[PDB]
Amino acid sequence: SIDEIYKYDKKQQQEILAAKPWTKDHHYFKYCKISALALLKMVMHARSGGNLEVMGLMLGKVDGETMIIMDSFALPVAYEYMAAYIENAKQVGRLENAIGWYHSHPGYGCWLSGIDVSTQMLNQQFQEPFVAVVIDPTRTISAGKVNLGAFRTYPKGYKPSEYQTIPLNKIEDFGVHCKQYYALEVSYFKSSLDRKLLELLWNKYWVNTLSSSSLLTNADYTTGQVFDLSEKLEQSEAQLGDKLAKATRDSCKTTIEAIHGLMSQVIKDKLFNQINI
Amino acid sequence: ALNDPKMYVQTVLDVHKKYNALVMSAFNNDAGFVAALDKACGRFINNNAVTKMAQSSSKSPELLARYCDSLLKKSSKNPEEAELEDTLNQVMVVFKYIEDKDVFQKFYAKMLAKRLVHQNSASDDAEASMISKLKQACGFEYTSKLQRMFQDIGVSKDLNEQFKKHLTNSEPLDLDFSIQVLSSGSWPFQQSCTFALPSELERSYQRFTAFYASRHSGRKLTWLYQLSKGELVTNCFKNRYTLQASTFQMAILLQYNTEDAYTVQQLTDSTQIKMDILAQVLQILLKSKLLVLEDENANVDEVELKPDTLIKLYLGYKNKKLRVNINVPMRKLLIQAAIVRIMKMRKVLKHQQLLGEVLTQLSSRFKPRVPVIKKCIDILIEKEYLERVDGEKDTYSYLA
Ligand SMILES: [Zn+2]
């Protein structure tokens, strides 16, 4: 039956909030579990603004080293409207409180800006569990895959690459504000049961899958991945003379995606072209 | 001080100078003596007590402008340009201590306009020196209005002497014509009262416009008859009288060319002058006793100036004064929030680049105008908000 993500346990949440285990170690949070509804609403709001920028809050809880997100609600926008709409979190009947904020970067990669990192610093300083989601609408529309942006920042006065596609303009902002935040591994959870049963509506499409036009839809994504892998491997070599394991994993995922696209193309060719010859 | 602020200003000048000399002799930069200086000059001088219950507070910091006006205005024997310059030099030092310098440039510009247009300015060469000193205080933008006012005075002076040369090639004018062309958008003056030009002054008028058509193309002329004067002589009286009067009084007097008496209504209809202005002109003319009515016993005060009384020119005019001169004078808070909001994202921004991003992005409501935004950004950067760059170009930065 698995599940067990739901059934918000108030006592455990209060205990983990009062313990404050992330104050001692800065790299406490490493895994971000976004829900299906969270992603659906986030991407819908991100694309419902086109090239304009949208932002809202996302509700969830904390379990050990993972931060689970169950819901997300948009915002009207800096004026009194946003503050008035914030009361929705405590006005409705829901036990998930609030865990962070999401905001879109329409065509500017997935990194965190200077104002973004400053707001995240403030939010972490006075609201201990907080994460920032920096999803990109244009990239997921063009490439057909969703890129995630869980980018929790570091504390002030403390000292301790993936979507590097910004050609000219905002790459300067990327370089200066790069060590001020660390990415979180995004691992999606499906509630199973009802949603797993109802996911048959994806099977209803059956045409975008049969004609996917892969390997050209996200050609720029693969070229960027290879470009990142090149200096990842160069850094692994410099250290060697485990970054090599990470470079090997990245190469394996990129190659697996390429071979999956080729397999889809071969299946389509066998299904359609090799009939009535 | 309110009644005669002339000697009040002179008191401040004398006290300040002597304070420096006494300290360096024996005190050797005493802490107590220096501290007491900054507390006395600020509160007691900048804003005095009687500005509250007299419903006059804006005029108090504006008495410095009229003092400098008196030095550059045509008057009796004035101090030479050897001791006056050094007193004006220390005036520049104390001027930067005041925070509302904007009102200083307004009142001095209005007072300079009345001094220049009426030829009442003295030492016009020294006037250029005074304005040049004000340029170094803030910049050419601060004195943008003032410099144009002085420039067109010189242009009109050369224009008049060129017009005289043009007169020799044509029929000579029966009267000496001089005109200050002034400029539009840089002067406080504006045409407000309609006027019917007398038939005697029309021809010269036309002549000048011809001279302004060949010399300049695509330029109009908004004549200000309320600011124009002239000299009119009488050739039928017992004695020659060369009176000096404005254009309105000139037209009123010239209306008696064909007849001897006129009623107020005909004067209003023929010259198309507004009721209030014409009433004031008629009253000041009656003060000089140039025009009289039938009933001497009638009092002008308790009897209203109805537009039916028949005033006739006084043919036996023998007024005891030969020097008659009737030419004597008769909270928004949105733009600051917008500025800080737009400076939030961009740490460093130019002044004019910031302008427009706030000036006209929200222009659909409450058109803010440049000076309001300039003043608001000044009072913002004053209170530890923008802290502009130390001099590298004109970037305003943020917390840098
Ligand atoms: Zn952002």
Tab-separated table of C-alpha atoms in Angstrom, chain A residues 78-79 115, chain B residues 341 344-345:
chain	number	residue	atom	x	y	z
A	78	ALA	CA	4.670	43.272	-4.186
A	79	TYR	CA	1.735	45.439	-3.109
A	115	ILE	CA	17.777	39.284	-5.242
B	341	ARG	CA	11.286	49.184	-6.235
B	344	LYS	CA	15.823	46.822	-5.875
B	345	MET	CA	16.591	44.596	-8.867
